[PDB]
Amino acid sequence: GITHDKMYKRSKTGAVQGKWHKKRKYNLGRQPANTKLIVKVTSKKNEGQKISTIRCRGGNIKRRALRLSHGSFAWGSADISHKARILQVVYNSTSNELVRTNTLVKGCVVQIDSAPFKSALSNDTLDKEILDQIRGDHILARISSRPGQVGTADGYILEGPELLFYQKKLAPK
Amino acid sequence: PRISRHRNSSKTYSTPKKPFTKPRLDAELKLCGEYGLKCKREIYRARYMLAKIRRTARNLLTLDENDIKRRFEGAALLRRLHMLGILDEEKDQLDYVLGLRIEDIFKRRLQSVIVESKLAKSVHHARNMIKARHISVGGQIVNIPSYMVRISNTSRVAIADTSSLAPNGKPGRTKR
Amino acid sequence: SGKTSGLYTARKLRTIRRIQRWADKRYRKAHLGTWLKANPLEGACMARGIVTQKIGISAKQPNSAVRKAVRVQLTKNSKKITAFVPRDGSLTYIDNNDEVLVAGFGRAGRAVGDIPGCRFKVIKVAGIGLLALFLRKREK
Amino acid sequence: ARGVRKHLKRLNAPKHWLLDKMGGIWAPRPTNGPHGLRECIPLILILRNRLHYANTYAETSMILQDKNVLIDGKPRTDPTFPVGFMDVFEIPKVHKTFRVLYDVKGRFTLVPIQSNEAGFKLCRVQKIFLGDKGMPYLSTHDARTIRFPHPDIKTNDTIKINLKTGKIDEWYKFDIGKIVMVTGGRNCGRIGTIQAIDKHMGSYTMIRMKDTEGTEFLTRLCNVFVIGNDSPAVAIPTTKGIRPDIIKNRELRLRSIAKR
Amino acid sequence: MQRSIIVRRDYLHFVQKYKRYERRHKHVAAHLSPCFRVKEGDIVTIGECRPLSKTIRFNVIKVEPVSEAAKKRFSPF
RNA sequence: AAAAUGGAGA
RNA sequence: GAAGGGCCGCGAGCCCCCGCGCCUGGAGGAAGGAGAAGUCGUAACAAGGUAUCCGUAGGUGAACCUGCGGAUGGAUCCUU
RNA sequence: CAUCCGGUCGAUCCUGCCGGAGCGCGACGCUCUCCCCAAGGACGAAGCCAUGCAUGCCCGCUCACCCGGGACGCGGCGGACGGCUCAGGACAACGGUUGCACCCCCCGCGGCGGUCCCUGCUAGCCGGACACCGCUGGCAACCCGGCGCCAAGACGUGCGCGCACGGGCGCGCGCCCCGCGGGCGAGCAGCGUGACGCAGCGACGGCCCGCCCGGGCUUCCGGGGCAUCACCCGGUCGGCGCGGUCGCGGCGCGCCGAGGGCCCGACGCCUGGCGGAGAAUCAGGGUUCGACUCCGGAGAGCGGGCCUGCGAGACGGCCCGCACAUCCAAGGACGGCAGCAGGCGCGGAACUUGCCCAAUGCGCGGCGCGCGAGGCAGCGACGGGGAGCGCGCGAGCGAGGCGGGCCCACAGCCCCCGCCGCGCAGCCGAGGGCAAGGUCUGUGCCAGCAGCCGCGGUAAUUCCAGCUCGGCGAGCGUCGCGCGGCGCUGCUGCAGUUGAAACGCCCGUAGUUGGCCCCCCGCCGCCACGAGGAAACGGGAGCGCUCCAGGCAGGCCCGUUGGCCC
16 A cells, blocks of 8 residues: 555664565555535536545544535534535645645635525624625635545634734735 | 474483593493493483582582572472482481482492392393393382382382292293 | 773773684684685585596605595586595596585695695595495495 | 464463463463453363363363353353453352362462352452443453443442342442452462552552561552452452462472372 | 754663673654753753654653753763 | 805605 | 546556666786795805894895995993 | 693793594484484575365255255355465564553453434335356356346345434633542543534344454664775754544655754665574683574565455455466466475485374364364484393393284374294594504505594504404494684783784874762662563472383372472
């Protein structure tokens, strides 16, 4: 397998250790998942959001980021949550190339739709910055769940001077 | 794992450090005649057994009395040597092993008892009589010459019924 | 000898022993590793082979007679080395190429006794021991 | 290498099993179960050798299956049945039942046991671990883990079993100096009471044990198997923990050698 | 190294052939945090931990800075 | 002033 | 949803330049070594007939000789 | 377990090495009347394999021109165990010490065993759908062609308690330190809230958690030579994110900052380099070897990839690259013995193309089978441990012949009985060390001998033989080897004014070494000294195989053993 073994890496002093044996199945590595997010299904129907379960050591079952576009967010302040399909991947931060293919990454800042979260405007001015994001149908949030290992699209909502730090980049930079 | 091959081997026969020394050489023949030993490997076999019996005592002597490793081993040393009779049971001393005699191990050998008790009256006669199954310890007939009997049961040495003791009725070629 | 002695000097003594170990002719003989490659015999009691040209090496002094030996190429290393024949008049049996085993002269390298320049000694010819051929114990 | 393995050669046998090195191409490995590998002496020797009820292991194979031994109601065909301290080997036909106690010489030996003693078997406990969605459980030294234990007890409590439903007989709690019975190192069949606790904010707790002989010795608390809240409360071996010494062993056999 | 210190322990090894010793040394890496900044020549404990990185497995806890220059002296503490 | 050999091996 | 195709993730091998490292083939040179009786001188060992000997240069059939600074293991433990 | 002696000479006293002398292991050679226990293709060939065998076991589901014996298949589980060889591999493998609150696991074993339902519902039992077979296909084989029915303790749809309950989420203790309990040494688990969501199994309801278990990392202390290898690494080295894995991680993939490691020898290079438990020989102190029992690691001609599974990069799994094959009818296929025999090759050399599951363990399985694992015999001067060829004046046996007994999967063997009994030896020397003829024959420094030191030049204690005789002995010698010898490798414990040897001289950095001196404190080191540390083996209880070598048995028995030191 595409192993992940210490012997393959050089020693700290720069020694190149010859591997004692061949590569091992419990040290096996797998295909990095490139997640697919649909801006619109529109006329085409060939692609749908499908998830992959894979064989693992010990029989454990792993859900994967095969095709995930629908997304869930729980307002930290409210503790209530709403589920819809998120707009796309906006701030991978590791690479801007990943954003183009909408490859989802754990806790990568994304573009969030407000199809069921428009209800926030009914409460009086809760998170006015979120209120300005919710009516627009475009928000910022980090999908804080592991997509490749556990196939999860549930995520937190961005609130706090952390959202402002990201927003300063998200607005013109 | 070749389980039946598993075993151990021993080296009773140990040759000396300088072979052609006149005193050692002469004593060999002199001892060979005294106890009637057929092969010269045996005297060295005796030397190896004698040394082990000499070292245990030297190390034991350098230990203080009643030291458990000393006390248990000392009583052990005396027990085995007293059984042999080379150590007089009366001596009863861990230090008494030192000054030991090779002649005493030879005396313990059953071939020797037969000559001494006049059972065959000669070492040459003794080996021949044992070869012809004519001396039995406690009645257990042995044809190997060096039965080696503990002194504790020396009084139980006996002759054999086949043609020496009270003839069973098998006089070798004479019978037929 | 100066000697460096201290509770923390296991370094000087360790290097010195390792370096000054290889000073003896005997130590270097077994520890350089040259001797296994250098010896015609590959460090063995006997080596099979085929016989080549016979040889009559003059002796030195006191010994003053030619001692017939046969030069044989050992099959394994493809090298030709001479082997001293055994007892009196034992070379007449050995003539053309025949299976010959060769053994050490005791010294293990030095030429035996006073017969100069011969390192090895033949022990067999054909399939029969050459010391039996001499006694006619085992002969063709 | 590769996956897990299931074979044992006749040298890898723990030297406390005292199975003979000779007369063995391969050792009897015990199958995993209530009792761990090192501790359980395979039941083949218990019937084939100690009892000498079976001439061969094949003879142990012939009768073990048909309900001939029942600790907590179970026999099995396997002569690798897992067993340990205070396990009541039960034989109806032998007209007797027995508890295997660690003999001083480090091999668990069956002591013929009375039916009241047959009723109770003992397994130690460690610390309560949440199991079943937080529904409480207690970790045990032998595999008998149970849900809903006594709520107040906290750590290192010995436990006894009725052998059928076998609900915990007693939650013995250590009071320090409580009659203890560690069984590890040289504590094989040794009786005493505890003294000094050296947890030391460090691994392996050293507990000193004062003894009837007079010896106080620290040890891993891992091998503790308390005998009674006070007194042995369960019959101990014929040694009674007194522990014999090699000098007597030569004499006890020496009279025995003359006596036979 | 960023937020990382290389601490050197010294081991005195008894060699039997010569009862004199060798001062072999080892340099091990850990993770310091700006909460306890370190001076040169300090006694720094390292805790056995989760394997952090390729060389990182330890983490600093207690720092005791020594005055002026501490040099070495091969002192194991 | 010149002024050189001394076979082998008991 | 197979036979296929594609984008690729891995991946032995290949090829082309090198950077090593180990092994080896040589026409012929250039040495070393060994065996009772070869040659030409005869250097040194007695101040061995010019006492040696070292370093360094120069020559030289061949050892050797010569120049200059030393050391005696010198043939001088010794006259203002 | 504390040692010599032959040799530089005209002699002496030396240094110094050569040689014997001791001891183990394998060749080799000369040889064997024994008997018993026994290693056995490790040695620059992990070279090639012809020929057979080496993981098989039960039919829930049998409807098979049978019987109570059941084929077959579907399924169930095992072939990830073992056996073998150490090729590769030098902060690795490896021994012991940590932890995994960075983690998976099948067997078994003790708990749990509520499982909303949107949909379809028969929920007291729903499907349609494959083998076996039936019928007829090809090829030179390999290889498996269709069709037709047909069942499952086969496979699949689905009922059932929204404190449904799959994970994984999102989110919610603290309040300067520390204690509390489901808690630990450690604020860790769990619960609640909010969003999803479809794990159970279930068509004969078993998912889940523990315990064990075997892994998977990991912490320290160890873990070949070479400096005629000194500066080396460039994901290299620290962070910062992320992917990926059972999992932590440069492991990968982005992003940065310039780090790492070194004369206490880094990096490099080499290794006829598997490490250890061990083994050899020795007073101590050592030295040497570890492939073979066992223990861990690897690897099945060679590199890669992959499946199946709970675990293998398995190789008597697969698929490709590369070599080399085999069949091959020219169209194809199909290997893998560093498993057991047995060949070829190779070398100095290294066992039956045997029998075989009764045991000894392991698989499937309460009513037994397999396992060239092993067991057994064969072979076998690897080696051991113990007899004989007489003793005596008579008569005595043991190598054997035949039958019995005994024995043994089957036979054998010791043994036990009788008629009988066919007792029978080598290979090294004889000048010294080193023990034993200046006997007697050839003999001319010739042959030859000759470890060594030395003999044969015409009168040999030294060869060539027959005398004799010394040693050892059914084993003797010849070699190569390791140790002792050898304080000739020196730490103990060596030399250096002339034997072998003080740098031509001085500064100098690491390195090594620093006087007295502060009683009491705290760390070093340091001993005493425990806990917990697998054996085998060895030190070492007890024990008479016909005596040991052996083995851990034995008997009216310490709960008889097998203690104890490793």
